[PDB]
Symmetry: C2
Subunit: 200 residues, 2 copies
């Protein structure tokens, strides 16, 4: 069925403001940033969202939804389970980061801001991490059954360790502006997965 | 007036840094307002800005104090170890013991500063980069000693291991901060141990 004018207006607000939220955060994103990005008035914007926090939550869902849809495309184009676990380097590094939203990883960006300021957004970050981990568990356990990976693999440890490596690699890149440094971490992620493979 | 001149001093400056560093670490430079600062210090705007040029100068000093604190803890824990391996694995106890009370309020300033500053604030991004690279250099120094003490193998890719450790520690913190559950971050610290076990000389 068809989107209403309200649905389309909210969608436009989110699309226009999500890159600002991802770079400036909830605290650094002003009313003027919102109105300038949309050419809508305060009253129009807040006739579509309850408050700024509500806009920020939707921006997170959008930004993280975007990373997820890229990740899904890449995973679905893989021919082995191992390759599904190693799409991250190309996702982050290709096109100088242009496959990610402007401002980088929204899970990283949001957690750091919301963790001690904004429980509802902290909860979404938490749920995003745990859903990613769950997807990784599923891929790993399919790789075990396909005999790509060893049956005694500690699946949970590997899944969380993957997340830690990818996000830590991104941190190092954003702190240093040098992809060579983060490339070492993405190399360690491949070492991590190679270490679970059955002997060739 | 008279009060601005009189409240300019190294001790007042240090008190300002100490009082406001937990607020910057939690709220960030953009989220920290003047009334946050005057409430945290119980001092007037005049006393604060008689010791610092502007809020940004206060944020920079806060970062140096916050990270200097993490550095000092890591230094103290490393100097209590018997083995090079142990020195590489003090991170879990530093972040998890006494419910995180050894870390600054708000968690890791390097993580917290980088996410804010990376696309908004050159000076502070540069500080975070220098921090990460100094931490990396220290780790390399420890690993190389471990190699010459025959604790770790000579074929070890020291730079690769040093950056991966950093990733694992910061990634562990991130997961803990997002989920509020130390059991999840404990899996990452477990992989930090596995990384270092994997560079040990053959048994």
């Amino acid at each position: 069925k068809e989107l209403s004018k309200s649905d389309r207006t909210r969608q436009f607000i989110i699309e226009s403001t999500a890159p600002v939220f991802n770079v400036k955060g909830l605290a650094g994103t002003s009313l003027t940033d919102l109105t300038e990005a949309t050419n809508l008035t305060k009253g129009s914007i807040y006739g579509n969202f309850e408050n700024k926090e509500a806009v920020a939550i939707a921006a997170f869902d959008y930004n993280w939804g975007h990373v997820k849809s890229v990740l899904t495309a890449k995973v679905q184009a893989c021919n082995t389970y191992k390759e599904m676990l190693l799409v991250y380097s190309s996702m982050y590094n290709d096109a100088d980061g242009s496959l990610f939203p402007v401002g980088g990883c929204p899970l990283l960006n949001t957690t750091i801001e919301a963790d001690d300021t904004h429980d509802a957004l902290r909860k979404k970050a938490g749920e995003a991490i745990l859903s990613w981990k769950k997807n990784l568990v599923t891929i790993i356990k399919k790789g075990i059954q396909a005999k790509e990976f060893r049956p005694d693999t500690d699946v949970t440890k590997i899944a969380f360790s993957m997340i830690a490596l990818v996000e830590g690699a991104i941190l190092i890149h954003r702190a240093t502006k040098n992809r060579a440094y983060s490339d070492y971490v993405f190399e360690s992620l491949e070492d991590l997965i190679a270490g679970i493979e059955v002997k060739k």
